[PDB]
């Protein structure tokens, strides 16, 4: 992901920085692992049935089932969007900190 291109008397070629790419892989794998691990959506196995004189508990059950699924959908989409933004800034800072290392 990050590296160098040198031009001198002997030759020219691209050389990758394996250490910064490995540390970037070390955060990106942990970001994907945290996004997978942190979601605790509970599984629905059967689906409940109700008769004609239990409309209030039927509407409450659909309210719970369509509220929890919307909350976890929002949580998954927001976590993926925020960590996408943090990844896209992390890579830019990883190139800039490499440029600053070569400058120093």
């Amino acid at each position: 992901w990050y590296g160098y291109h040198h031009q001198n008397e002997q030759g020219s070629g691209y050389a990758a920085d394996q250490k910064s790419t490995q540390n970037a892989i070390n955060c990106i794998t942990n970001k994907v692992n945290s996004v997978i691990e942190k979601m605790n959506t509970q599984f629905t196995a059967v689906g409940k049935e109700f008769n004609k004189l239990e409309k209030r508990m039927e509407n409450l059950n659909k309210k719970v089932d369509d509220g929890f699924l919307d909350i976890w959908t929002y949580n998954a989409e927001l976590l993926v969007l925020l960590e996408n933004e943090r990844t896209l800034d992390f890579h830019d800072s990883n190139v800039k900190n490499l440029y600053e290392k070569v400058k120093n």
């Epitope: 992901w1 070629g13 691209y14 990758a16 790419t21 490995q22 892989i25 794998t29 994907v32």
Partner: antibody, heavy 128, light 105 residues
Framework: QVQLLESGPGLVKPSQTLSLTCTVS??????????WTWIRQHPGKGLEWIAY???????SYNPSLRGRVTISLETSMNQFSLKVTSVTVADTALYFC???????????????????????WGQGTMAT | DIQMTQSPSSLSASVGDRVTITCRAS??????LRWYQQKPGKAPQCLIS???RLQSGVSSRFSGSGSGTEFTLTISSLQPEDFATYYC?????????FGQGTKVE
């Protein structure tokens, strides 16, 4: 399911050319991020590294074997080869080809697939 | 030429014992060590890469530690399928040198 298949001569005279090839099946050899490596093992002895190649172009060879061997990357036929010149008594070995990845990647964040980050090996061929 | 010293070159233990294979480096190997397991009549496979991190398909009994010159490979409990020659390979330099091999028995 990337596999490495080796074809060797099996019988060469002394002071000749030992041409080995390692055919990559189930994947591409034209993927960056791997060392396409050649490891030999003398019978009743340990492993000895010979050379590697990379699709970028870098090649590194053993200090005992700088001028004798050469390693090439055949991009079109999906294989990489090792050619040994001036074959002697010490050159008979169990030759392994390997795909040593650059990075430790268990999810395919660089490699792209979970099986990209894996170090696969050829089963071995014997040259005499 | 970074020359690799691996001890003990001959090792014997029973089922359930714990051993430690130590590989020593001439120069400074900064977390660039690969541990190998060559079972007889079989191609070598990597157990530890980057001197501490377990490979995929390798059980959690194997463990690696160390930095710089000294590295350790500890098997927590030897099974009967753990009969192999163990190698240490450095790739910090552009020339790679394997260890001479420790055969557990």
């Amino acid at each position: 399911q990337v596999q490495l298949l080796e074809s060797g001569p099996g019988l060469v005279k002394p002071s000749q050319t030992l041409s080995l090839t390692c055919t990559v099946s189930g994947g591409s050899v034209s993927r960056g991020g791997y060392y396409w490596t050649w490891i030999r093992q003398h019978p009743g002895k340990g492993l000895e590294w010979i050379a590697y190649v990379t699709y970028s172009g870098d090649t590194s060879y053993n200090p005992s074997l700088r001028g004798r061997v050469t390693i090439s990357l055949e991009t079109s036929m999906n294989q990489f080869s090792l050619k040994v010149t001036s074959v002697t008594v010490a050159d008979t070995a169990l030759y392994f080809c390997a795909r040593v990845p650059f990075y430790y990647d268990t999810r395919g964040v660089f490699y792209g697939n979970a099986e990209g980050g894996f170090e696969i090996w050829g089963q071995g061929t014997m040259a005499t | 030429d970074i020359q690799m010293t691996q001890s003990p070159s001959s090792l014997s233990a029973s089922v359930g014992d714990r051993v430690t294979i130590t590989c020593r480096a001439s120069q400074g190997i900064t977390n660039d060590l690969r541990w190998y397991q060559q079972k007889p009549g079989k191609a070598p496979q990597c157990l530890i890469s980057s001197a501490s991190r377990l490979q995929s398909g390798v059980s959690s009994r194997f463990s690696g530690s160390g930095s710089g010159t000294e590295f350790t490979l500890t098997i927590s409990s030897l099974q009967p399928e753990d009969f192999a020659t163990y190698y240490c390979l450095q790739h910090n330099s552009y020339q790679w040198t394997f260890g001479q091999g420790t055969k557990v028995e």
